[PDB]
């Protein structure tokens, strides 16, 4: 017997088994395609005859065959397990059309025929991992953004906010500015190298303007990084020019409310009676979202814009790159949730819609 | 005496976790699933007397 | 004043009885309603095999006179 | 013996506190259930009178 | 009556002197078909239930008074 | 799958709602209004465009007394919905919409034509909002009260059919509450310092002068847009202060409440007293409104009496079996309790009275959308579809033949 946990990040799949602390296998979620279509890094290794593909576009599915095959290869190589003797837990972004839910339910049941299945939003599982009752979740995921005010382990779809800005667009902008600095970054290797440089030295400025003054005056901000070719890159203001775009969509030519502005909008969309508690129950999301000076700066910005009459107690788990998967393992490791699973015969007797009848 | 044709409820207990369930009635649901609906009436908080005191 | 729903799982105790029992497939098949004279073609999640059966639910065509 | 006696009474009061918290946790937990088994839906279910 | 669910002591070092590895009293989780519960059991009764073959998964006749 | 991937849409006096069929809640919502920057032109929809400051917005509400105003705006808003939220081709998906008690047949034909031809919808349907809400309560013959943002109307229903005669287009709504807040500000003299023009809201106490900083980067806005975002602020304040005296109002009784410490965008925060209860009592009777001798409006109990009397005798017991609420302005506290008190007083005990127990914001507002999804779910309704083939055949004129 085994327990299966499947976390499908915006651009990287990270699966594991209930009770485990970390995913079994992890890798970017890309799909090869011959001009046999291979999976993720498997496809990447064969770039010559396989073309990169992202089934999780916008944080959303594209073609059922693509993730059919990602699961195929997952099971056959990474897990190398027989899930059809174990429950299958899956997660989704909020506001997903019922079409996708029924489609994935049917694909599971027919293609793989696993006994027990169940689905639940990523944000609520991450909150479960965070061990708190009522609050607001910021979904600074990897490909898309959302703001989920969860109450009593229960969320209101209307109150949620959406935005398809995440580490991929941040990396694209950082690549653009680095090229503007006098460098160049075109192919996949360059994209991943830019993401590497970001993950290494990029951080979140406190006072972006005095931060500019210091970067243009204090060269300490300007730092040296060995590129894969060995090239040393001076990186000063650009260490944090991109992250400030999060509060300023104008950085990329986009127009919208900043991240904390978005959060204030969301909390307003809730009921006032518990917005103080929500403030007390901030959240963070995304392994691509732990950059230094981020939690404190966001705390300051909320304290400013959010009325001080309420308590703004931030919550910044430094280990949130897997929050969703960790919460999923925790949930799958609960007694009262075992009953809640959904059997294959239940589908055979009710069809895919049973998921929308029970899977909540 | 109020005369509600469909709001006819009754007491009973359950098989495995036997206990006074309170005024409840079975009812069909989506996907052809029966569901027990337990009501909430004048004696809701006192659903344990037994022996018809 | 809630309502319990049917539970079939209960516990991980049902290893067998499935490998011998295929899950009869369901398809988002088209269909037509007789009650619609124009016979508008709509869709059902029928269990594949239940294809072509007359619209079972349009037998309520009772009207005033 | 006096120190021994006062330690005994201190234990008595700690134990009253421990019993109080035991009662609190028990009265808090009081879990319920919102499911009923498939077979417990079809056959000679029950009878009211 | 019921089925022995669990069994635990109420450890306390309060007793005078000595390494305080002492049990204030025992906690016994018992389950009947009606339900489950546990009761406060004095230290001496653990020796008794040793006397009997008390093991997880069996029932017992515990005279209250 | 006796449900097809249909989408239900609900647009009320205050905001715009929609969502899949058979679901618990509408998927999304956003302000009824749209910000216009005259130069196709620059349309500002949803918060990121509307509330966030820009230059030269002339916000426009394409609605009026539940009527279509700016057809181009409706088309643009539908496209905005589709792209920004749904991201689907409803041409592949049946759709339907509610309707007003009084929507012109001309505009209904116009929208039917537009839907079928442009939006390529596969099927359509229409029905009155109050009918949807009554369905939501599982009711066939009752009285609907809605304090939408625009009006405070009452409309009875019978066998799932509205009484055309029962329409009451009372003015009072969240607009009236905004006017009350404005007269309150006047009598106690606080201006409107909108948040957007405040860089920092510095520490300030009760009575303290408005201390704040402005962000220099603030291109000027229009009086329309700025006033309407101020109106949003005012509605937020009302919600923070919503309440009505449960009995005959008294100034000192209302003052007995501890003045609630409400803060403003500038950071200033004073404490408000009996005014929040002096104001609403007029809603229950406009005549008693001090200063404003409103008489044209019918007090709450007066509305009840009018609606009941204008019906016929036989069903009035049936309508009294149900009483329903709806609308953006229905957020008011002491709403239903004082409503029923005024009933028990003015409403004779001769006929048994019964209300509808629903007060959550979800129910209290989107009962109509819930009823719409409810109807969409039903398996029998499919014969009542409206195939696009039939529309192609008989133009948009099929509506009169098939819709009375």
Q: What is the CATH number of the domain that holds A193?
A: 3.90.640.10
Distance CA F198, CA F191 (A): 14
**Strand partners of residue F261:** F271
Containing F18, the helix (H) or strand (E) segment is strand F15-20
Q: Which of F106, F168, F161 is nearest to F307 (CA)?
A: F168
Nearest to F27 among A95, A307, A309 (CB): A95
CA distance B35 to chain C (A): 5
Distance CA F28, CA F19 (A): 7
DSSP string, A104-141: HHHHIIIII--S-EEEEEHHHHHHHHH--SSEEEEEE-
> In chain B, which residues have their Cβ closer than 8 Å to the Cβ of C5?
29, 33, 35
Nearest to E16 among D4, D10, D15 (CB): D4
Domain count, chain A: 3
Is the domain of A7 the same as that of A87? yes
Q: Which chains share 3+ C-beta pairs under 8 angstroms with F?
A: A, C
Q: Tally Cβ neighbours within 10 Å of residue F181.
A: 21
Distance CA A161, CA F261 (A): 29
Q: Which of F257, F199, F173, F226 is nearest to F55 (CA)?
A: F226
> In chain D, which residues have their Cβ closer than 8 Å to the Cβ of C6?
35-38, 41
Q: Tally Cβ neighbours within 10 Å of residue A17.
A: 19
Angle between helix F174-188 and F275-284 (nearest 10): 140
* Residue C37 three-state SS: coil
Phi, psi angles (nearest 5°) of residue A147: -130, 110
Distance CA A87, CA A346 (A): 14
Residue contact F47–A265, C-beta within 8 A: yes
Angle at F188 between CA F185 and CA F191, to 5 degrees: 45
Phi-psi region of A131 (alpha: psi -120 to 50; beta: other; left: phi over 0): left
Residue F145 · residue F325 · CB < 8 Å: yes
Angle between helix A259-269 and A294-305 (nearest 10): 50
Q: Which of residues 12-41 of C touch A (CB under 8 A)?
A: 12, 14-15, 17-18, 21, 23-26
Residue A107 · residue A66 · CB < 8 Å: no
Mark which of A256, A283, A310 sits at the end of a domain. A256
B16: contact with D, CB 8 A cutoff: yes
Distance CA A89, CA A93 (A): 14
Distance CA F287, CA F172 (A): 13
Containing A83, the helix (H) or strand (E) segment is none
Q: Which of residues 9-38 of D touch E (CB under 8 A)?
A: 10-11, 14-15
Residue A190 · residue A184 · CB < 8 Å: yes
Is the domain of A25 the same as that of A108? yes
Count interface pairs C-D at CB distance under 8 A: 21
Is the domain of A107 the same as that of A148? no
Residue F57 · residue F221 · CB < 8 Å: yes
Distances (CA, A) of F281 to A106, F153, F284, F309: 57, 18, 5, 23
Distance CA A204, CA A240 (A): 5
Residue contact C6–D34, C-beta within 8 A: no
Residues on C contacting B at a C-beta cutoff of 8 Å: 1-6
Judged by 3 or more CB pairs under 8 A, whether F touches A is yes
Q: Which of residues 333-352 of A touch B (CB under 8 A)?
A: 349-351
* Beta strand residue intervals within C5-64, DSSP E: 5-7, 27-32, 41-46
Residue contact D14–E14, C-beta within 8 A: yes
Phi, psi angles (nearest 5°) of residue A304: -65, -65
Distance CA E61, CA E3 (A): 10
Residue B20 · residue D46 · CB < 8 Å: no
Residue A177 · residue A240 · CB < 8 Å: no
Q: Which two tokens stand for residue B22?
A: 């309170």
Residue D44 · residue B8 · CB < 8 Å: no
Phi, psi angles (nearest 5°) of residue A253: 80, 5
Q: Which of F4, F14, F19 is nearest to F370 (CA)?
A: F19
DSSP string, E41-54: E-THHHHHHHHTT-
| Cα diameter, chain C | 59
Q: Which of A101, A90, A94 is nearest to A149 (CA)?
A: A94
Q: Which of A271, A276, A302 is nearest to A155 (CA)?
A: A271
Distance CA A124, CA A327 (A): 8
Distance CA A301, CA A312 (A): 10
- Residue A256, judged by CB atoms within 10 A of its CB (0-12, 13-18, 19+), counts as middle
Residue contact D14–E16, C-beta within 8 A: no
- Strands of B24-29's sheet, edge to edge? B24-29, B33-38, C5-7, D35-37
CA distance D48 to chain B (A): 5
Distances (CA, A) of A191 to A40, A197, A201, B31, F71: 16, 10, 16, 49, 46
Distance CA F266, CA F263 (A): 8
Q: Which two tokens stand for residue C15?
A: 């290893």
CA distance B12 to chain D (A): 5
**Strand partners of residue C52:** none
Experimental method: cryo-EM
Distances (CA, A) of F314 to F62, F139, F311, F347: 40, 17, 9, 16
Is the domain of A192 the same as that of A250? yes
Is the domain of A44 the same as that of A111? yes
Q: Which two tokens stand for residue F226?
A: 């700025």
Distance CA A90, CA A67 (A): 13
Residue contact B37–C6, C-beta within 8 A: no
Is the domain of A108 the same as that of A152? no
* Residue A208 three-state SS: helix
Is the domain of A89 the same as that of A21? yes
Containing A170, the helix (H) or strand (E) segment is helix A167-180
CA-only gyration radius of chain E, Å:
13
Q: Which two tokens stand for residue F42?
A: 């620059």
Residue F318 · residue F141 · CB < 8 Å: yes
Containing E22, the helix (H) or strand (E) segment is none
Residue E25 · residue E43 · CB < 8 Å: yes
Distances (CA, A) of A272 to A180, A268, F173, F240: 45, 7, 21, 7
Distance CA E46, CA E64 (A): 15
Q: Which of A85, A84, A160 is nearest to A121 (CA)?
A: A160
Mark which of A222, A237, A256 sits at the end of a domain. A256
Distance CA A329, CA A340 (A): 15
Is the domain of A62 the same as that of A102? yes
- Residue A226 is part of which domain span? 165-256
> In chain E, which residues have their Cβ closer than 8 Å to the Cβ of D29?
none
Is the domain of A181 the same as that of A44? no
Distances (CA, A) of F96 to F156, F243, F369, F374: 23, 36, 11, 13
Is the domain of A8 the same as that of A111? yes
Residues present in chain D in total: 49
Is the domain of A25 the same as that of A159? no
Residue F245 · residue F251 · CB < 8 Å: no
With a CB cutoff of 8 Å and minimum separation 6, the contacts of C16 are none
Q: Which two tokens stand for residue F240?
A: 């923070």
Residue contact A353–B32, C-beta within 8 A: no
Residue A148 · residue A118 · CB < 8 Å: no
Residue of D nearest to C11 (CA): D37
**Token pair 């009869």: residue:** C24
Distance CA A23, CA F286 (A): 65
Residue of A nearest to C26 (CA): A351
Sign, CA dihedral F206-F210-F212-F215, equals positive
Residue of A nearest to B29 (CA): A357
Containing D2, the helix (H) or strand (E) segment is helix D2-29
Nearest to D48 among B12, B34, B36 (CB): B12
Percent helix / strand / coil, chain B, rounded to 5: 10, 30, 60
CA-only gyration radius of chain D, Å:
24
Phi, psi angles (nearest 5°) of residue E7: -170, 130
> In chain B, which residues have their Cβ closer than 8 Å to the Cβ of E35?
17
Q: Which two tokens stand for residue F201?
A: 């809201």
Is the domain of A89 the same as that of A196? no
Residues present in chain F in total: 404
CATH code of the domain in which A34 resides: 3.30.420.40
Residue A292 · residue A204 · CB < 8 Å: yes
**Token pair 């609606």: residue:** F307
Residue of E nearest to B14 (CA): E34
A254: contact with F, CB 8 A cutoff: no
Containing F232, the helix (H) or strand (E) segment is helix F223-241
Mark which of A201, A227, A256 sits at the end of a domain. A256
> In chain F, which residues have their Cβ closer than 8 Å to the Cβ of C28?
1
Strands D35-37 and C5-7: parallel
């Amino acid at each position: 017997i085994a327990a299966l946990v499947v976390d499908n990040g915006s651009g990287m799949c990270k699966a594991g088994f209930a009770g485990d602390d970390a995913p079994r296998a992890v890798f970017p979620s890309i799909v090869g395609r011959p001009r046999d279509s291979y999976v993720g890094d498997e496809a990447q290794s064969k770039r010559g005859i396989l073309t990169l593909k992202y089934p999780i576009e916008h944080g959303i599915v594209t073609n059922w065959d693509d993730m059919e095959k990602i699961w195929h290869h997952t099971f056959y190589n990474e897990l190398r397990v027989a899930p059809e003797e174990h429950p299958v837990l899956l997660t989704e972004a909020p506001l997903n059309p019922k079409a996708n839910r029924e489609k994935m339910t049917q694909i599971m049941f027919e293609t793989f025929n696993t006994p027990a299945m169940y689905v639940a939003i990523q944000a609520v599982l991450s909150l479960y991992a965070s061990g708190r009752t009522t609050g607001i979740v910021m979904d600074s995921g990897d490909g898309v953004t959302h703001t989920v005010p969860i109450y009593e382990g229960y969320a209101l779809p209307h109150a949620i906010l959406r935005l398809d800005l995440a580490g991929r667009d941040l990396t694209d902008y950082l690549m653009k500015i680095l090229t503007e600095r006098g460098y160049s970054f075109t192919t996949t290797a360059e994209r991943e190298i830019v993401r590497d440089i970001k993950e290494k030295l990029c951080y979140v400025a406190l006072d972006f303007e005095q931060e500019m003054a210091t970067a243009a005056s204090s060269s300490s901000l300007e730092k040296s990084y060995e590129l894969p070719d060995g090239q040393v890159i001076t990186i000063g203001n650009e260490r944090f020019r991109c992250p400030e775009a999060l509060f300023q969509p104008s950085f990329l030519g986009m127009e919208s409310c900043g991240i904390h502005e978005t959060t204030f909008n969301s909390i307003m969309k809730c009921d006032v009676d518990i917005r103080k508690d929500l403030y007390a129950n901030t959240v963070l999301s995304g392994g691509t979202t732990m950059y230094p000076g981020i939690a404190d700066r966001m705390q300051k910005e909320i304290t400013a814009l959010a009325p001080s009459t309420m308590k703004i107690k931030i919550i910044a788990p430094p280990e949130r790159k897997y929050s969703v998967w960790i919460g999923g393992s925790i949930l799958a490791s609960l007694s009262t949730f075992q009953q809640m699973w959904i059997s294959k015969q239940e589908y055979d007797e009710s069809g895919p819609s049973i998921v929308h009848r029970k899977c909540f | 005496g109020l005369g509600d044709v469909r709001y006819r409820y009754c007491l009973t207990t359950l098989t495995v976790p036997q206990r006074c369930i309170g005024f409840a009635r079975r009812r069909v649901g989506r996907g052809g699933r029966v569901l027990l609906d337990r009501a909430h009436s004048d004696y809701d908080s006192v659903f344990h007397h037994l022996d018809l005191e | 004043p809630l309502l319990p729903s049917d539970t079939g799982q209960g516990y991980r105790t049902v290893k067998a009885k499935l490998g011998s029992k295929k899950v009869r497939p369901w398809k988002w098949m088209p269909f037509t309603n007789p009650a619609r004279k124009d016979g508008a073609m709509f869709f059902h999640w029928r269990r594949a095999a239940e294809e072509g059966k007359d619209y079972p639910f349009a037998r309520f065509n009772k009207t005033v006179q | 013996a006096v120190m021994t006696a006062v330690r005994a009474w201190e234990f008595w009061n700690l134990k009253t506190l421990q019993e109080r918290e035991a009662r609190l946790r028990l009265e808090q937990e009081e879990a319920e259930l919102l499911t009923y088994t498939r077979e417990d839906a079809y056959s000679m279910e029950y009878v009211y009178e | 009556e019921g089925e022995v669910t669990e069994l635990t002591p109420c450890e306390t070092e309060n007793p005078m002197g000595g390494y305080g590895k002492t049990i204030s009293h025992v906690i016994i989780g018992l389950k009947t078909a009606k339900g489950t519960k546990q009761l406060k059991l004095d230290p001496s009764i653990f020796e008794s239930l040793q006397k009997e073959r008390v093991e997880a998964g069996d029932v017992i006749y515990i005279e209250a008074n | 799958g006796d449900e097809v991937g249909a989408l239900v849409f609900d647009i009320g006096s205050y905001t715009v709602r929609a969502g899949y069929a058979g679901e618990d809640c509408p998927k999304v919502d956003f302000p009824t209004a749209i910000g216009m920057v005259v130069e196709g032109p620059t349309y500002y929809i949803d918060t990121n465009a509307l509330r966030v400051p820009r230059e030269n917005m002339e916000a426009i509400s394409p609605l009026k007394n539940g009527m279509v105003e700016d057809w181009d705006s409706f088309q643009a808003i539908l496209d905005h919905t589709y792209k920004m939220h749904v991201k689907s081709e409803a041409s592949l998906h049946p759709v339907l919409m509610s309707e007003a008690p009084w929507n012109t047949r001309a505009k209904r034909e116009k929208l039917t034509e537009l839907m079928f031809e442009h939006y390529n919808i596969p099927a359509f349907f229409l029905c009155k909002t109050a009918v949807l809400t009554a369905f939501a309560n599982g009711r066939s013959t009752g009285l609907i009260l809605d304090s939408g943002a625009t009006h405070t109307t009452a409309i009875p229903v019978h066998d799932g059919y509205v009484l055309q005669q029962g329409i009451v287009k009372s003015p009072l709504a969240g607009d009236f509450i905004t006017m009350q807040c404005r007269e309150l500000f006047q009598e106690m003299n606080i201006e409107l310092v909108p948040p957007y023009m405040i860089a920092s809201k510095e520490a300030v106490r009760e009575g303290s002068p408005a201390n704040w900083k402005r962000k220099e980067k603030l291109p000027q806005v229009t009086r329309s847009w700025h006033n309407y975002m101020c109106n949003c602020v005012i509605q937020d304040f009302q919600a923070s202060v919503l309440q009505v005296s449960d009995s005959t109002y008294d100034e000192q009784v209302a003052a007995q409440m501890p003045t609630v410490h409400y803060e403003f965008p500038n950071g200033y925060n004073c404490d408000f007293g009996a005014e929040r209860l002096k104001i609403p009592e007029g809603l229950f009777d406009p005549s008693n409104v001090k200063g404003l001798s409103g008489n044209t409006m019918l007090g709450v109990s007066h509305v009840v009496t009018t609606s009941v009397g204008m019906c016929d005798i036989d069903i009035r017991p049936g309508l009294y079996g149900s009483v329903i609420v709806a609308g953006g302005n229905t957020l008011i506290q002491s709403f239903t309790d004082r409503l029923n008190r005024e009933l028990s007083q003015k409403t004779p005990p001769s006929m048994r009275l019964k209300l509808i127990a629903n007060n959550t914001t979800v129910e209290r507002r989107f009962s109509s959308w819930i009823g719409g999804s409810i109807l969409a779910s039903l398996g029998t309704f499919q014969q009542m579809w409206i195939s696009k083939q039939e529309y192609e055949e008989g133009g948009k004129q099929c509506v009169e033949r098939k819709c009375p």
